[PDB]
Enzyme design. Structure first.
Site, PDB file in Angstrom:
ATOM      1  N   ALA A   1      70.733  -9.679-125.358  1.00 39.78           N
ATOM      2  CA  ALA A   1      69.772  -8.648-125.000  1.00 39.78           C
ATOM      3  C   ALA A   1      69.240  -8.830-123.570  1.00 39.78           C
ATOM      4  CB  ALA A   1      68.673  -8.560-126.057  1.00 39.78           C
ATOM      5  N   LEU A   2      67.962  -8.555-123.351  1.00 37.33           N
ATOM      6  CA  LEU A   2      67.422  -8.396-122.004  1.00 37.33           C
ATOM      7  C   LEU A   2      67.494  -9.695-121.181  1.00 37.33           C
ATOM      8  CD1 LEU A   2      64.266  -6.277-121.226  1.00 37.33           C
ATOM      9  CD2 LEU A   2      64.732  -8.395-119.972  1.00 37.33           C
ATOM     10  N   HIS A   3      67.098 -10.823-121.773  1.00 36.17           N
ATOM     11  CA  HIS A   3      67.181 -12.119-121.077  1.00 36.17           C
ATOM     12  C   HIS A   3      68.613 -12.413-120.628  1.00 36.17           C
ATOM     13  CE1 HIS A   3      66.750 -16.688-120.815  1.00 36.17           C
ATOM     14  NE2 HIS A   3      65.743 -16.253-120.083  1.00 36.17           N
ATOM     15  N   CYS A   4      69.593 -12.042-121.460  1.00 32.43           N
ATOM     16  CA  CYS A   4      71.005 -12.289-121.182  1.00 32.43           C
ATOM     17  C   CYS A   4      71.545 -11.536-119.969  1.00 32.43           C
ATOM     18  CB  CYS A   4      71.845 -11.908-122.408  1.00 32.43           C
ATOM     19  SG  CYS A   4      71.568 -12.952-123.810  1.00 32.43           S
ATOM     20  N   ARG A   5      70.880 -10.444-119.595  1.00 29.06           N
ATOM     21  CA  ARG A   5      71.386  -9.522-118.578  1.00 29.06           C
ATOM     22  C   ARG A   5      70.483  -9.471-117.346  1.00 29.06           C
ATOM     23  NH1 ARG A   5      73.057  -4.734-123.007  1.00 29.06           N
ATOM     24  NH2 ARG A   5      73.277  -6.230-124.726  1.00 29.06           N
TER      25      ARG A   5
END
Ligand SMILES: NC(=[NH2+])NCCC[C@H](N)C(=O)O
Ligand code: NA
Length: 419
Positions: free
Chosen positions: A302-306
């Site tokens: 999700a957001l942390h990953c991107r």
């Protein structure tokens, strides 16, 4: 070079000052997120060419993005998972900020090569830590601890655990390399799918329903941190994000005084997760972020990953171990080191404090005892007086910082015992 950075070394946490956030085109994040990021922070977009930069600029313009905060790096990449392949930030040689490269644990050679272009763009030195790693499986507290899932050892199986730990010490200053068995029972084995330091004394740990197969593993992980003394000397404050349907609530980004939390339904359960962050992090703006239809949030991605935060190469760094809880006295002396990575003259360095909870915080100048080393002694306090305080520093490069980062909304608290 192929040498480690000149010591001492200190890995920079996600909740320290960030000069920017790093994302990649073709996108894996919604335009609304880029817009929200760019309102207050520099967004560096990775693109493959000048023409691609201009394609992105057209899209940003059409979406009403704040272009004054839009920067670009031209480099080949294989993916939008900038969390996992971009460089890690560390202070070294007293007052320098550097980038640490590693062997990306995926067959993605352009992603793997990218950190050199990042360091070149930022104008900082890069150091090569020869470990198979991934940023999604890494977090540091900013005081020499790092938590990773077990793949930090198992994907470096030609090295002993001691040798892996030593690489982390030499390149990142990690003295407490806390490698644990992943509690999530999924393929990815990244800490950011179950755990997140919110501050040096706060950790968020995923929770699932009682009948979920990983329920006990996650409860055990929460208990492990709750029993553990943190860098400030208190036990970790352990917060729980309840995933009723594998929502990626721990996969958030802390960027300066804002927190971007991915949400994917139901609305009530999303709001419960946001409430946990709000309770844990007074003074921070907690922002729920809906996913893009084409590249939705996933439980494992999700957001942390991107995204990846980018440290300030001119960082005004405050080193401080706080005075907390019941304090004996009769002296109540705080100490802080302040270092300007901009090589700027530091002035003033202040303690802001409040006694027994009322009125406004008052400023007092700290005394510089030796170069970069400041102290302050709380005077005139009576037995059972309650003190709130924080540290503030500024330099002539225009930088202004507090410790803790958020400052006045979440001050350090102690009680004068006079014993
Ligand atoms: N952090 C976060 N990471 C998500 C990476 C997901 C990607 N499919 C991979 O396994 O490489
Ligand atoms: Na690499």
């Amino acid at each position: 070079s192929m040498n480690p950075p000149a010591g001492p070394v200190r890995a920079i946490a996600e909740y320290e000052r960030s000069a920017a956030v790093l994302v990649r085109y073709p996108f894996g994040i919604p335009m609304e997120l880029i817009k929200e990021l760019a309102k207050n922070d520099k967004v560096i977009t990775i693109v493959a060419s000048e023409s691609q930069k201009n394609t992105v600029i057209t899209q940003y313009t059409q979406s009403g993005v704040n272009l004054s905060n839009c920067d670009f790096i031209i480099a080949k990449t294989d993916s939008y998972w900038t969390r996992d392949y971009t460089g890690w930030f560390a202070m070294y040689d007293t007052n320098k900020v550097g980038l640490v490269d590693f062997i990306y644990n995926r067959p993605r050679p352009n992603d793997d090569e990218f950190p050199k272009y990042e360091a070149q763009y930022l104008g900082i030195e890069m150091f090569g830590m020869k470990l198979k790693q991934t940023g999604g499986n890494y977090m540091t507290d900013g005081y020499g601890s790092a938590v990773q899932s077990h793949i930090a050892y198992t994907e470096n199986s030609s090295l002993s655990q001691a040798q892996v730990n030593q690489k982390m010490k030499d390149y990142l200053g990690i003295t407490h390399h806390d490698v644990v068995q992943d509690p999530n029972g999924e393929y990815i084995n990244h800490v950011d799918c179950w755990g997140k330091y919110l501050a040096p004394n706060k950790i968020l740990i995923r929770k699932v329903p009682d009948n979920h197969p990983q329920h006990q593993a996650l409860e055990d992980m929460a208990a492990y941190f709750a029993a553990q003394t943190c860098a400030w000397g208190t036990k970790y404050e352990v917060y729980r994000a309840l995933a009723t349907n594998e929502q990626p609530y721990t996969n958030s980004l802390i960027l300066n005084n804002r927190v971007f939390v991915p949400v994917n339904g139901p609305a009530s359960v999303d709001n419960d997760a946001l409430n946990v962050y709000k309770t844990a992090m007074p003074g921070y703006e907690i922002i729920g972020v809906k996913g893009a239809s084409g590249t939705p949030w996933l439980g494992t991605d999700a957001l942390h990953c991107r995204t990846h935060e980018v440290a300030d190469k001119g960082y005004l760094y405050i080193k401080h171990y706080p005075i907390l809880g019941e304090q004996a006295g009769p002296d109540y002396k705080i100490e802080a080191d302040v270092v300007s990575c901009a090589n700027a003259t530091i002035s003033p360095v202040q303690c802001y404090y409040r006694i027994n909870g009322s009125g406004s915080f008052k400023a007092a100048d700290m005394t510089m005892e030796s170069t970069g080393h400041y102290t302050y002694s709380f005077t005139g306090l009576n037995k059972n007086d309650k003190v709130e305080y924080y540290i503030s520093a500024a330099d002539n490069s225009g930088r202004k910082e507090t410790y803790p980062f958020i400052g006045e909304p979440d001050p350090f608290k102690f009680t004068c015992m006079n014993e």
